Write a protein that binds this ligand. Structure first.
Ligand SMILES: Oc1ccc2c(c1)CN(c1nc(Cl)nc3scc(-c4ccccc4)c13)C2
Ligand SMILES: Oc1ccc2c(c1)CN(c1nc(Cl)nc3scc(-c4ccccc4)c13)C2
Lengths: 219, 8, 229, 9
């Protein structure tokens, strides 16, 4: 991971992208089923994020347990960018606001609008998603140094993409900061979604897969 | 538990 | 707001810093869950008044309507308290300096159910800041970013946030960091803000828990802060 | 809200 060029970093992350899946109380079933299937693909994707497989299996488990809902939402926000006012959970599951929980929905919509107004690029998106994976559990020695060294390389990669797009040095640093501050909002949305997920699990209304139940137990 | 096997 | 130089931004933010307040710690009696929680809620209460007046000295903040000022502070207040706590604690490895008369280790945090989990995260952030050798000029920039950013997604604020990014880069260049060290450190500092958001949300759920089990009475201010989240 | 009044006093 530490010897890849910036262009090589971007191509690796682009190649690792998971596929977009389809869906089939009733709403929750589709959403939980969808999240479960997306998690399985997320694990294969994580194994292709450069530097991730260098970590121990225990550290890999911890990072995915901390990051998985953040990753689901940034993916959701990304594929909803070109549908103002909607969230594209699946190509056949495009939801307007009124179809919601809704507090989470509104925050996801606002993030998509932010991405659209900044004109977030696909190459930038995949860098952001790998940062979420490596950052969201790092604060909870040699292995931590390795994750931080990989994180620095992903920052270099983002800056490289911005310089290649013609941004001045000042615009590069500003746009870098704008992107990373959105990750704080994505953490907030995942925090809120985990709390909702736990309430759902206390109730027996919604069927939750064993993997999801193990994910929820980790929080 | 499931995540372990899934990563392996 | 936008007419400020980087050095004038730093000077304004340093001059606006709130004082370090003392807790109401009574060393005549042992700690209980209730008495710990009483100290922390009393301390947060008194710090909030200073934080409100600090916030009006954050450039760009007074230009906002009262409703928007309320929203920003309601979103960010606990993040702001904890980044301040972490900053105060950097020179006390293994401890959290809630106040000069309330310097606690994690064994003392176990006195309140659920507190040790948050205690450990704050300790980890404090050691992260220590390892990075966070500077006070950078710290005040980060605390202003939290104020303006945390409630932003719930143009003028984004221009102001951009100036603060310029200010952070200026500070790093003046410290002698290479161009590429500059953007790496910017990213490292801003990524810690996601962990501070996380810690706030845990702290806010813990506050709601103590309040729902009648552990301590919350002031009207803290009650309305909790209502907002 | 207390906060509303605190901000302007
Ligand atoms: O790419 C994806 C795929 C699936 C999902 C998300 C992004 C986001 N997420 C949700 N989002 C919104 Cl707006 N309301 C809700 S109500 C319940 C969920 C839910 C279901 C299972 C696991 C966690 C949450 C949910 C579900
Ligand atoms: O400058 C300050 C002043 C007071 C406080 C903090 C920083 C941080 N903070 C906490 N920290 C840790 Cl380690 N566990 C916990 S459990 C509950 C809280 C809590 C209490 C009241 C109001 C909000 C949150 C808390 C309390």
């Amino acid at each position: 991971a530490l010897s890849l060029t910036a262009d090589q970093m971007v191509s690796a992350l682009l190649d690792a992208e998971p596929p977009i899946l389809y869906s089939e109380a009733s709403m929750m079933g589709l959403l939980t089923n969808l999240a479960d299937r997306e998690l399985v693909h997320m694990i294969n994707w994580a194994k292709r994020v450069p530097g991730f497989v260098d970590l121990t299996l225990h550290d890999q488990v911890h990072l995915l347990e901390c990051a998985w809902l953040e990753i689901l939402m940034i993916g959701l926000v990304w594929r909803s960018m070109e549908h103002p006012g909607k969230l594209l959970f699946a190509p056949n599951l495009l939801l307007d606001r009124n179809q919601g929980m809704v507090e989470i929905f509104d925050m996801l919509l606002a993030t998509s609008s932010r991405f659209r107004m900044m004109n977030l690029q696909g190459e930038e998106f995949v860098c952001l998603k790998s940062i979420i994976l490596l950052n969201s559990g790092v604060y909870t020695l040699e292995e931590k140094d390795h994750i931080h060294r990989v994180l620095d390389k992903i920052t270099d990669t983002l800056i490289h993409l911005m310089a290649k797009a013609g941004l001045t040095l000042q615009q590069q640093h500003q746009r870098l900061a704008q992107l990373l501050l959105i990750l704080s909002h994505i953490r907030h949305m995942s925090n809120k979604g985990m709390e909702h997920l736990y309430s759902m699990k206390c109730k027996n209304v919604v069927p939750l897969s064993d993997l999801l139940l193990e994910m929820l137990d980790a929080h | 538990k499931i995540l372990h096997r899934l990563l392996q």
